[PDB]
Amino acid sequence: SKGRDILTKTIILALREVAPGLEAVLEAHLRATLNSGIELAYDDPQKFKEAVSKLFGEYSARLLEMVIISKLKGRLGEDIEANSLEELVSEIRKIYGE
């Protein structure tokens, strides 16, 4: 779906902004532990967060969550008030009628 694609792609761009290899590192982790990709952020935000926490810890996971939200606010601009990835996905679904 459109919302799913924008979230996934925007997260990937954020990972690339952090460092060249973060996409590869996180994807290696997601594939090996959940047989999933970055799309998990949209499909199951809670599980995605838990997976990131298992990779670098909760502090790092929270930092990533904060960055992702800030980046989506920068792309979608309009009224994003989410404080969590779960809230962010909920808002995206409302914006795109999903």
Query: What is the binding site for a second copy (CB under 8 A)?
Result: 17-22, 24-25, 27-29, 31-33, 53-60, 62-64, 66-67, 70
User: Residue 46, interface with Zn ion (CB under 5 A)?
Assistant: no
User: Residue 1, interface with Zn ion (CB under 5 A)?
Assistant: yes
Query: What's the CA gap between 29 and 21, in Å, rounded?
Result: 12
What 3 state SS string does 16-54 have?
HHHCCCHHHHHHHHHHHHHCCCCCHHHHCHHHHHHHHHH
R_g of the chain computed on alpha carbons? 12
* Binder of residue 58, out of a second copy, Zn ion, none (CB less than 5 to 8 A by kind): a second copy
Q: Is 58 annotated as a binding residue?
A: no
Q: Is 17 annotated as a binding residue?
A: yes
User: Residue 33, interface with Zn ion (CB under 5 A)?
Assistant: no
Q: Could you tell me if 41 and 47 are in contact, meaning their C-beta atoms sit under 8 angstroms apart?
A: no
Binding-site sequence positions for Zn(2+): 1, 17, 23, 27
Report the interface residues with Zn ion, using CB under 5 A: 1
